[PDB]
Each structure stands twice: as C-alpha cells, then as structure tokens.
C-alpha cells in the first residue's frame, strides 16, 4: 500500500499514512484496508466522470458503494446530497467508517439491492459494479433520475459493452462519453436527446 | 460567432472575456478567452490533463491555437509551460489570452510541432488534426522525460487506427482512450 494518485484533485491514501500532497488543494481520501472493499482503473474512470459532471451541486446516488470511495469523493466535490447503497452489512460499515476517517458524517446509507425501495430521484446516479448487475440497474434508472439527470457507470469489461450499449438504447439513454483503460470501460450517460 | 460559458468540469470553466460569470462553486477556476478546435476536443484534452497533473509537470502544448490548453495546464499548477504554433495569429492570441488570465510566464515559440524545440517535458499536449499528429508522433521520444506522458485530442474516430499504428511503431502505449461523439482523446506513455 501507498498513495494512489487518481487526478490533480484526488488521491487515495491508506488510513495509517501521514501524507502531505505537493498540491495543497489535492483532496486526500483516507480508506481503511482492513475493512471490506477496489480496482484502481475502474475507480479512476468513475472519478473522471464525476469530475466532469459536477459543475454545480448535484444530488447523488452511489449504487453498490462498496468501500464508499465514490460517495465520499462526490461529497468532497460539492454534492448537494449523497445516498450510498449496497447489499452487505460490511459495505455499510466500510462506507460509514471510511466517511468518518475523512471527517464526513452526513452521507446517507441504505442497505438495499440496486435502487429497490429508494424513494427519491437524483441528478447523478453513479455505479462501479459488474456489467451483469448494471444490466439489472439500467431499467431502474428512469424512475430515479431527475430531468437533465446524468449517470456514470464503471466496472464494464470491454466484451460486455455491446450488451450495455443495447440496454441503454432500449431504455432511451445515450452515451456522452466513453472511456477505456486496459480492458475496463467507463461511461457518462444521459437521457436520449 | 456567438460565444457562451463552457462548463468543462468541477474545477474549470471557460468564459468569454466580456461575460460576467459567477460560478456556483467558489473555487471553480475561470479561464477568460478572447473570442473563445471545438468544445468536445478541448474537453477530452482537459480530462487528460486533469488525470495527468498529480504534481507540477513541465508542459509542452503543441499547436496551441488560442492557448487554452497551455493556460489550463498553468492554472492546474504546471511547473512550466511552453506553447508552440506555426501561426503568428496564434502566438498573439495565446499571449493575449494568457495576460487576460494574469499569466506572463508561458513560453511561446513559433515553430512547426517540436522542430527547433530544445529540451524535454513531463507532459506533451496536442489537440490538432490527426494528419499532423502523425508527424508529431516520431518527435515525441526526444522531447519526453522518463515517465513522461502525452495527451492527444482532435482525432476523428475513423483516423484512430493509423494513430494507434504509428504509436506502436514508436514504442508508445495508450493508457486511456476517451470518445465523445466522433472525437477521440488519448493518454499515452512509453511502452514498458
């Protein structure tokens, strides 16, 4: 373990480290490796999408939050609100504890599969999860997305992209930005316009 | 043409010199431009720069045009920035746009690509036609520091296979490929 530089404005650091970034305004996100949850490439793709999308405070749902990394980054980047969801107790623990390590106590957490039983709508839905689960998320997006709502997917293997692209088209979503690092794909998504 | 605010990212917006813009986020940097390639290719190159600038890097912006990418790199905390173009009009625009943002230490050189450029850089940025990028590719090695990175934008997706070929032949690899509409941006580094 050491510092994972994601961008000019984001680095990830293990909780024990005493790290001073050369850029004083580069945000440092502390994570506890002893807790559950990831993939550095897919995290970076999702983060670049969030950096692109967050031109004003947006309401955010981070689906399949795992360690909470993306929910935490969204909060630091000025989200209007953040809901983080996952299926496991240990994700709920990791997200809360990792948030707290970064001095954040107001990220809302819900133990739930995808967006089942999530009442509100959001400006930004973010999901770094495997493509077969994304396929189940796609038909849920519309009813949980504000008008002008945007979506960021990551964790897509390149071989899975046709199936993702077809399901997005079928649900009237377009891809504004496609990113590929190694075999991994990230997408910035909005309603067909 | 008419020019409006271009909201690039959380940390950057491009604003026409005259336009009074108060960003919602207090710390979203504003780049002022007179008048002010296009939106899409600029945004891809910017994402590349945002990803790459994890510490102060020495930067070369090739085919600078308005000087937008040179200025953005400077604002994101580049150690130094050299901007090149063949055109006298571009040299003027880049100088004036830099001054409009209170920047006076971007180096400017009127030259084709990296011919006549002495020295090497941590980061080479070029948002230009793919045909010109093809000529730039063999110039990269001798102008790039070890662990140096290269950002290309301005590629139409149909012209990508020839760029990929020329990069491979010059012992470069693509770390990140970005596509928005028909436009391609690339983050590039030395192979192994």
Curated annotation (Swiss-Prot), chain A:
Keywords: Cytoplasm, Methyltransferase, S-adenosyl-L-methionine, Transferase. The keyword Methyltransferase applies. One of its GO terms (cellular component) is cytoplasm. The keyword Isomerase does not apply. It catalyses: L-lysyl-[protein] + 3 S-adenosyl-L-methionine = N(6),N(6),N(6)-trimethyl-L-lysyl-[protein] + 3 S-adenosyl-L-homocysteine + 3 H(+). One of its GO terms (molecular function) is protein-lysine N-methyltransferase activity. Its main location: cytoplasm. S-adenosyl-L-methionine binds at residues 43, 64, 86, 128. It comes from the Bacteria. GO terms for biological process: methylation. It is found in: Cytoplasm. Its EC number is 2.1.1.-. Belongs to the methyltransferase superfamily. PrmA family. Methylates ribosomal protein L11. This is Ribosomal protein L11 methyltransferase. The chain holds residues 119 to 313 of 314 of the full protein.
């Amino acid at each position: 373990y050491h510092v994972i530089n994601l961008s000019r404005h984001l680095a990830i650091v293990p909780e024990w480290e005493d790290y001073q970034p050369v850029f004083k305004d580069q945000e440092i996100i502390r994570l506890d490796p002893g807790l559950a949850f990831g993939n550095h490439q897919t995290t970076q793709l999702a983060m670049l999408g969030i950096e692109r999308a967050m031109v004003k405070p947006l309401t955010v749902a981070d689906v399949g939050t795992g360690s909470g990394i993306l929910a935490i980054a969204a909060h630091k980047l000025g989200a209007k609100s953040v809901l983080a969801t996952d299926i496991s107790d240990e994700s709920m623990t990791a997200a809360e504890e990792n948030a707290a390590l970064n001095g954040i106590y107001d990220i809302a957490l819900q133990k739930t599969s995808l967006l089942a039983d999530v009442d509100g709508k959001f400006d930004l839905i973010v999901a770094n999860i495997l493509a077969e689960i994304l396929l189940d998320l796609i038909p849920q997006l519309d009813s949980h997305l504000n008008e002008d709502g945007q979506v960021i997917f990551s964790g897509i293997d390149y071989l899975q992209l046709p199936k993702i692209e077809q399901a997005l088209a079928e649900n009237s979503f377009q891809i504004d930005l496609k990113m590929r690092a190694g075999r991994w794909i990230g997408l910035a998504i909005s309603r067909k316009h």
